[PDB]
C-alpha cells in the first residue's frame, strides 16, 4: 500500500497526494451505481440522489486528506527553499516526505470507511437490476452511461498525443542532463535535485500513459460488444462489472497523467530559471 501514492505539484507552491487504489475503487463504484440506475428507464430519477451521494463521498474523503495538510504545507515550504540559492535541506525534505506519507498511513481505516460506504451503496443499486425477461436483457444502461460519462473522455484523450507529449519530455531531460555534464558550485546541487525529481516524474507519466493507451483501445473494443444486444441477466451483470473495471482503470490513469503533465512543466519552468541565473547573471 505504501508504493501506490502519487504526489502532484502542478503550481509552484502546490502538493497533492492521490491514493491510486482508493481513487480506482471509488471510481469503480461510481460507474456501477450509474449503470444500475440507467438500465431501468423508471430508475432514471435516482440520478439526483446518486450525484449528491457521490458529492458527499468526495467531500468526506477530502475532509480526511485535509488532516495531513499542515504536514503537506510544511513539506511544500521545504521544497520551496530547496529549489533556490544542502545536506540538512535534503534530509529536511526526506524527513518531511516520509512524515507526510506516515500521516496518510495513519488514516488507513478513516479512508476505507468512506470506501466501504461507497462499495455498499453501489452494490445496493446493482443488486436492484431489473430485467423484463431475465433471458433477454437490454443494453440501454451501458449506452447512456458510455455516451454521457465515458465517450467524452475517450475523445478528449484521443485528441491529445500522449506519445508526442512523452517524446517532448525525453528531449527536455536529454538537454538538461547534457548541460549538467558540461557544468565542470552549489547551483549544480539544486539542479541535480530538480532534474532527478523530473526524471522520476517522466517514469510516472510514461507508466500512466501506457495504461491510458491500452485502456482506450480495450474500452473501444469492449463497448462495441456490450451494446445493441439482448444479454442473459447473468452475462449482463458480468459485462457491467467488466466495463466499470476498464472505465475505473482508464479514468484514474488519465486523471493522474494530466496532473503529472502540469507537474513536470511547472518544475521544468523553475529548472530553466536556475539556468538563466547560473549563466546570464553569473558568468
Amino acid at each position: 500500500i505504501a508504493n501506490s501514492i502519487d504526489i502532484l505539484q502542478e503550481k509552484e507552491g502546490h502538493l497533492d497526494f492521490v491514493i491510486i487504489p482508493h481513487y480506482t475503487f471509488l471510481d469503480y463504484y461510481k460507474h456501477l451505481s450509474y449503470n444500475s440506475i440507467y438500465h431501468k428507464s423508471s430508475t432514471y430519477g435516482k440520478y439526483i440522489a446518486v450525484d449528491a451521494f457521490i458529492k458527499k463521498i468526495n467531500e468526506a474523503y477530502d475532509k480526511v486528506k485535509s488532516k495531513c495538510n499542515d504536514i503537506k504545507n510544511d513539506l511544500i515550504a521545504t521544497i520551496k527553499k530547496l529549489e533556490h540559492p544542502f545536506k540538512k535541506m535534503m534530509d529536511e525534505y526526506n524527513t518531511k516526505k516520509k512524515k507526510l506519507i506516515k500521516c496518510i498511513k495513519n488514516h488507513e481505516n478513516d479512508f476505507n470507511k468512506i470506501c466501504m460506504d461507497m462499495k455498499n451503496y453501489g452494490t445496493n443499486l446493482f443488486e436492484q437490476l431489473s430485467c423484463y425477461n431475465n433471458n433477454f436483457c437490454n443494453t440501454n444502461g451501458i449506452r447512456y452511461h458510455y455516451d454521457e460519462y465515458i465517450h467524452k473522455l475517450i475523445l478528449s484523450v484521443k485528441s491529445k498525443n500522449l506519445n508526442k507529449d512523452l517524446s517532448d519530455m525525453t528531449n527536455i531531460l536529454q538537454q538538461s542532463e547534457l548541460l549538467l555534464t558540461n557544468l565542470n558550485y552549489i547551483y549544480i546541487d539544486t539542479i541535480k535535485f530538480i532534474h532527478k525529481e523530473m526524471k522520476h516524474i517522466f517514469n510516472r507519466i510514461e507508466y500512466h500513459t501506457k495504461i491510458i493507451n491500452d485502456k482506450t483501445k480495450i474500452i473501444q473494443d469492449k463497448i462495441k460488444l456490450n451494446i445493441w444486444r439482448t444479454f442473459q441477466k447473468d452475462e449482463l451483470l458480468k459485462r457491467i462489472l467488466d466495463m466499470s473495471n476498464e472505465y475505473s482503470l482508464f479514468i484514474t490513469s488519465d486523471h493522474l497523467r494530466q496532473m503529472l503533465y502540469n507537474t513536470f512543466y511547472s518544475k521544468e519552468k523553475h529548472l530553466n530559471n536556475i539556468f538563466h541565473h547560473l549563466i546570464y547573471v553569473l558568468q
Partner: antibody
Amino acid sequence: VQLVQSGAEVKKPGSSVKVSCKVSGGTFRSYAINWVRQAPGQGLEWMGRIIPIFGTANYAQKFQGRVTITADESTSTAYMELSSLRSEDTAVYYCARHGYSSGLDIWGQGTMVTVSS
Amino acid sequence: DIQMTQSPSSLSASVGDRVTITCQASQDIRDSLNWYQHKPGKAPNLLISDASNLETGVPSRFSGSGSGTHFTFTISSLQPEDIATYYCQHYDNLPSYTFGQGTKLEIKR
C-alpha cells in the same frame, strides 16, 4: 441534442439523392441514426439504420441495393443515398436516433424529396 | 419479419372520451413496442417507449399497456389536441423496425 436534415429537393427520375442529418453533439457516440420515409398517403416506412461506432448499416429488404447510408465523423452528419429514383420515391424522409428507451427518440424535421423531371 | 396488425384504421370518438388503439404481432415480442403520435407536417413524436413507459413530457392521459402478441394504447380523456395519426412499432436488434398500419383519430363533435 438535435437532428438537422437538408431542405426539400426535386430530383430527376433515374438520379440519386443525398439527404443530410447533422447531430448536435460533435460525434455520433453509440447512437443509431435511422431513416424512415412517409410516402404520399402511406404510413411510416422504415428504410435503414446506421450505427457509426459499429461502422455497419442495416437496410430493409425493399431498400437494399438502392439505399446506402453513410456517416461523416468529421462533421457528425449521417447521409442517406437513394439511387436511381423513380416517381414512387416522392416522400418525406425522416431522421431518428434510437434512444435509451429502445425507440425513435430524436426526429429530424423532414426532407420533401420529390421525383419529377 | 413480424407483422404488426394495428387496428382500427379510423376512429371518430368525441371529446372527454376514452380511446383504445391496439397493436398485434405475428410472433412473440416481449416488451419492444413503441407508440408514436404523427401530427401533420410535424415529425412523429414518441409517446410510449418499451410497451408501457410514458415518454418524458407526454401527458398522463396516454398510457401504453400489454405485452406478448397483443399490446394496447389508451387515451384516458380525448382532447382536441389529440387529433393525429397514431402508429405502433417494434425493434428486435437484428435489426427489425417493423411498423404499425396507423389509426387516424378524428373527433366527432
